[PDB]
Amino acid sequence: MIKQRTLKNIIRATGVGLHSGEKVYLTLKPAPVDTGIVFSRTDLDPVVEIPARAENVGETTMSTTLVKGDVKVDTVEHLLSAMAGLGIDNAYVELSASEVPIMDGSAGPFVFLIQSAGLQEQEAAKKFIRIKREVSVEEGDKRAVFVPFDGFKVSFEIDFDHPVFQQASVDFSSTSFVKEVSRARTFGFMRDIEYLRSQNLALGGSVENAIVVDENRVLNEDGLRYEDEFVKHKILDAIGDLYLLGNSLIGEFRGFKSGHALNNQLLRTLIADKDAWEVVTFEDARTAPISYMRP
Ligand SMILES: C[C@H](O)c1nccn1Cc1cc(-c2ccc(C#CCCCO)cc2)on1
Ligand SMILES: [Zn+2]
Numbered sequence: 001m002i003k004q005r006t007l008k009n010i011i012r013a014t015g016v017g018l019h020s021g022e023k024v025y026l027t028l029k030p031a032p033v034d035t036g037i038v039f040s041r042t043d044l045d046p047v048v049e050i051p052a053r054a055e056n057v058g059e060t061t062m063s064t065t066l067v068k069g070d071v072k073v074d075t076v077e078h079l080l081s082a083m084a085g086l087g088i089d090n091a092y093v094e095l096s097a098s099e100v101p102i103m104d105g106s107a108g109p110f111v112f113l114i115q116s117a118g119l120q121e122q123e124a125a126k127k128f129i130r131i132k133r134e135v136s137v138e139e140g141d142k143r144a145v146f147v148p149f150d151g152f153k154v155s156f157e158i159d160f161d162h163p164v165f166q167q168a169s170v171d172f173s174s175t176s177f178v179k180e181v182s183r184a185r186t187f188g189f190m191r192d193i194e195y196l197r198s199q200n201l202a203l204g205g206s207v208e209n210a211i212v213v214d215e216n217r218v219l220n221e222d223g224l225r226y227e228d229e230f231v232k233h234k235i236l237d238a239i240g241d242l243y244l245l246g247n248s249l250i251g252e253f254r255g256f257k258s259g260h261a262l263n264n265q266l267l268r269t270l271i272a273d274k275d276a277w278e279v280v281t282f283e284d285a286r287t288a289p290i291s292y293m294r295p
Helices: 077-086 108-117 177-181 190-198 229-243 260-272
Strands: 003-007 011-016 023-030 037-041 048-051 057-059 065-068 071-073 091-095 119-125 128-131 135-139 142-147 152-157 167-171 187-189 211-213 248-256 277-280
Touching: 003 023, 011 108, 023 108, 037 071, 048 065, 048 071, 077 108, 077 177, 077 229, 108 119, 135 260, 142 260, 152 229, 167 229, 177 229, 187 190, 187 229, 190 211, 229 248, 229 260
Parallel strands: 037 091, 128 248, 152 248, 187 211
Antiparallel strands: 003 119, 011 023, 023 091, 037 048, 057 065, 065 071, 128 277, 135 142, 142 248, 152 167
């Protein structure tokens, strides 16, 4: 069967929140079958746990934020992207502050740290959400859609009105999450960055954790990791936002100028429309439409 995964060993890391600029200590731990991914604010007494589920998304402006009452965990989407990309069903993610550390802007450090710890298969079938009807949501010129598909693929199309320019598709039948998506970094434009800082956001961002663009060019000395890094990062973000379904997808996602907001809107419409999806397991990995790398 395709089995659930958790972590073999604990992972720790120390970083800064992209928006908050606060130092934060992260610890990922193993969790039992059917736990899902659960964030814990361990700086608080008592500790405040928030499952990484679409129902818990509180704000979607320039990151995806989980909220339970007054308590938040901001910027979950890169780490969630990594966990999704590696097949991780169950994990606790402890944080000593309100925002997941940004690392280098991408999921590369998370996938490295995870894979250095190692994964552990669990004796229970992995549950997938299978798209059985097209579900779309739109708002103005922005669109996000789920289409039935026997596998998992993601397409994205951004319309940026800027000299540094995009679209891309990835199908995990041939694309490596790790090699081709995980390294794509967080990005931003000088006009927004100042506005965001004036709105007291973006406080931790720098050329160390993001592509910084002026009116013409990428200012980072070392340039890009992929020719299409920006759009590959949008795919990264979307995989992370979609993992808030709390199970891997069998289907296709297509995003057209979509962001965290519309991505969450799509999850919510999907979840509400039970005719459009069903949960499935695969007792024989050999006949399934997807595969995972070795644990
Ligand atoms: C997080 C989300 O998933 C996300 N992924 C890609 C983009 N975004 C939104 C976003 C980008 C930034 C950002 C903030 C500050 C700087 C910077 C800088 C240095 C300026 C000093 O000259 C660069 C970028 O903030 N939010
Ligand atoms: Zn991002």
